[PDB]
């Protein structure tokens, strides 16, 4: 369990990535911090970066 459990089943918060207004600072860096290292983990490997904590 976690607040119900693990992204409480059906709940998209329904705020689009497109609904964000031009946050080319925010969206890019938050993307690199959370949205990217789940996908291109091997680049963090290949450069040996130890990705940022939070």
């Amino acid at each position: 369990d976690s607040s119900i459990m693990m992204l409480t089943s059906d709940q998209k918060p329904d705020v689009m990535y497109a609904d964000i207004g031009g946050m080319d600072i925010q969206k890019q860096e938050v993307r690199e911090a959370v949205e990217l290292p789940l996908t291109h983990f091997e680049l963090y490997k290949q450069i040996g970066i130890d990705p940022p904590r939070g």
Binding site: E32, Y44, Q46, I47, I49, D50, P52
Partner: protein, 98 residues
């Protein structure tokens, strides 16, 4: 707590010098693929008493510079921007007085 018959060896922890910052730099950056023509003691002398927290942070910002390029290659220019990537303030005035 501080009874010497209770604590028998109290060792201090200094923030490191140029050579030790160079060493910590080598430690973290050894797995980092650094290109060529890259000096490191210059980066160590760009550090005005770096504790070791931000010494790791310079290398992570260098890795982030390599990540924002779709590259795997790190120049010394990346560190030249990465040292610049750390500065905070504590600027305000009409407070010098003292």
């Amino acid at each position: 707590l501080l009874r010497p018959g209770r604590i028998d060896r109290k060792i201090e922890f200094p923030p490191p010098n140029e050579e030790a910052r160079l060493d910590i730099l080598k430690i973290h950056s050894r797995k980092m693929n650094l290109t060529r023509g890259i000096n490191l003691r210059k980066i160590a002398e760009l550090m005005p008493g770096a504790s070791g927290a931000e010494v790791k942070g310079v290398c992570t910002e260098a890795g982030m510079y390599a990540l924002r390029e779709r590259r795997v290659h790190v120049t010394q220019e990346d560190f030249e921007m990465a040292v610049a990537k750390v500065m905070q303030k504590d600027s305000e005035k009409n407070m010098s007085i003292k």
